[PDB]
Amino acid sequence: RLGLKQAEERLERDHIFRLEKRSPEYTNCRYLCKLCLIHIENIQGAHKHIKEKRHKKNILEKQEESELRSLPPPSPAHLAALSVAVIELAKEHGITDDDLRVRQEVEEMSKVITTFLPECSLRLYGSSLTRFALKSSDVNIDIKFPPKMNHPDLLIKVLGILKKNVLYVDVESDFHAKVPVVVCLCRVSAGNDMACLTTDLLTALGKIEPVFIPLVLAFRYWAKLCYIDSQTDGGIPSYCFALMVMFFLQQRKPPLLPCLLGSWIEGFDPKRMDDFQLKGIVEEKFVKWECLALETPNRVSLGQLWLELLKFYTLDFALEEYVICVRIQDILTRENKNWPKRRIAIEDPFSVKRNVARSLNSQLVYEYVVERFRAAYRYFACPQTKGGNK
Amino acid sequence: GDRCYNCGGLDHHAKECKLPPQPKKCHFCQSISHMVASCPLK
RNA sequence: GGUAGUAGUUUGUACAGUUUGAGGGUCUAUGAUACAACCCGGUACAGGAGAUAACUGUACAGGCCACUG
Ligand SMILES: [Zn+2]
Ligand SMILES: [Zn+2]
C-alpha cells in the first residue's frame, strides 16, 4: 500500500505524474508526461516511456534549461562591458544617417525613370529606411504603387530601361516572389499597400526610442550569424525580427514602447480586433486609432536589455504557446486566430489575416533556433572577456 | 542473478515481470517497513 | 478570394512492435568427463526497469501536378 508510492517515486524524477482523475480523451490511460505530452496506462508502460529516446533527449534539454536558470546574476562591471560591446557592435555595422542620405540621393533613379514614364512610383523602403540592418532585409529600394494601374505592364516597361543600358550589370527580373521584382540591388514591386504602412512605424520608432535601433541591430546580426534571418530556404522573415524585438519591449515588465492600439480606445472589445484598422503615422504620434512615445523616458544599459530579451525568448515563456503580436499588450492564444501550431506565429499590426512568418514549419529549424538561443544566452550571461560579446 | 526490481523475485526480471507494483521488501530481514540499507539488526 | 476533401508518387520528425551486426559478468572455482547424464564455491550486488542499424503500417506540417463539393 504505502510502498506503491516508492514505485512511482522513481518515475517522479523523470517528470512522470499519475493522473489525478481519468481524462476523457484517454480514458484507459492513467499517467502523463510533463515534457513529452503523452498519456500512459500502466507503470510498465511508464518505464518503457523512460527508455524512449525522445524522453531522454528532452530530459537533457530540461536539465540544461534548469542549469541556465541557475546562472549567477551579472555583475555591474560585466553589465557595463556588455553594454559597451553591444553599442560597438551596433555602431560598427549600423546604417547611419549619412548612409541613408546617400541612399536617398533613389531620387536620381526616379528622375531617370520619370523621363520614360510620366507617372513614376518610387519610394525608399527596407533596411536603409528603417536603419535596422545593413542591406539585410528589403535591400535598397522596394517600391509600392497604387492598384488603379496594372502592375505587370508597369513592371515590364520599367525593367525594360534597366535592362537596356549596358552600364548596369546583372539586371534580371524575377516573378517568383509574392510580388514581381526586378534586380539591377534595385527592387520594383508595384501594388504594395501595407509594407510602407509598416516601414512607416519602424522609421517612426527609430528616434523615438534610442535603444530600439541598437537592440534590433544586434538581433539582426545574431540572426545573420545563425542564418535564421533569411526568409528563403526556411527560417523566419528577415524584417519581422524587428517586430520580434518590439514584442519583447512591449511585453517587458517595465515597458519601453507604448501600445499601438488599446492605449487610448473607446468600446474596446478584446474578443476580436479584426474590424479595427490602422493608418500611417501622424508626426510620430500613436498610429491611427479612428474607426508612439512613452510619457516618461526610459533609458537603461543596453546589456540589461539584451539579457532581458534573451531570458524572455529563451527561459521565460513557451514560443509555441502564444503569438508574437504588437497590436495589444495582452497575450493572445494561437488557437483563437485559427493559426497553425507548427509555424512560429508572428503578426504585424496592419495585417492579421495570415501569419507573416510561415517558413519555420520544419521542426528541425525551430530546434536549431531554440538551441542557438540557449547557446547565446549561456555565452552572454556567463562572465567572459569584453562582456562575452562578439 | 539479481532480484526483480518490481517484485524482488529472482524468478523473473522486471521486463518479464507482469505483476503490478507492490511494496518493496528488505532482503536482510524480509520487512517492508524499511530497506536493506536501513536494517536495524544488520 | 475563404473553409474542407481528394488516387498513387514524395517531404522531415516521432513512433506498438518484428529481424541482423555491436552490447554489458569473465577473476572471484578443486575435481569430473570415448563422443558414458548433473556439480566443491571466503573473496558479489545495490535500491537500482538493461543496447545500434534494414523492413512493417501510422497522428503531425506544408506539396508533387494540379483538382472537387
Ligand atoms: Zn518480478
Ligand atoms: Zn532489514
Residue numbers in the entry:
A (entry chain A): 274 to 378, 380 to 458, 466 to 572, 619 to 717
B (entry chain B): 136 to 177
Article passage:
Tumor-suppressor let-7 pre-microRNAs (miRNAs) are regulated by terminal uridylyltransferases TUT7 and TUT4 that either promote let-7 maturation by adding a single uridine nucleotide to the pre-miRNA 3′ end or mark them for degradation by the addition of multiple uridines. Oligo-uridylation is increased in cells by enhanced TUT7/4 expression and especially by the RNA-binding pluripotency factor LIN28A. TUT4 and TUT7 are multidomain enzymes whose specific targeting of RNAs makes use of three zinc fingers, combined with two copies of a nucleotidyltransferase domain (NTD), one inactive in the N-terminal half of the polypeptide (pseudo-NTD) and one active in the C-terminal half. Our structures reveal that pre-miRNAs engage the enzymes in fundamentally different ways depending on the presence of LIN28A, which clamps them onto the TUTs to enable processive 3′ oligo-uridylation.
To compare with TUT7, a truncated TUT4 (residues 254–1315) with a similar activity to the full-length TUT4 protein and to an N-terminal-only truncated form (residues 153–1649) was expressed and purified from the E. coli KRX strain and assembled with LIN28A and pre-let-7g before polishing by size-exclusion chromatography. A 3.68 Å cryo-EM structure was obtained for the TUT4/LIN28A/pre-let-7 in the pre-oligo-uridylation capture state found also as TUT7 ternary conformation I. This structure enabled us to identify more clearly the interactions between the LIM module of TUT4, LIN28A and the pre-let-7. Although the CM of TUT4 is not well defined in the 3D map, density apparently derived from it can be visualized in two-dimensional (2D) class averages of the complex, roughly oriented in the same view compared to the TUT4 ternary complex in conformation I, in line with this being a capture state before CM engagement with the open end of the pre-let-7g. The 49AGGAG53 recognition sequence from pre-let-7g was observed trapped into a positively charged pocket created by TUT4 and LIN28A. Together with the TUT7 ternary complexes this structure therefore provides a demonstration that TUT4 interacts directly with LIN28A, a currently unresolved and key question in the field. In this ternary interface, a hydrophobic patch is formed between G276, L277, A280, I316 from TUT4 LIM (which are conserved in TUT7: G216, L217, A220, I256) and prolines 156 and 168 of LIN28A. The side chains of four positively charged residues R283, R286, H320 and K324 from the LIM participate in the interaction with G51, A52, G53 and A54 of the pre-let-7g.
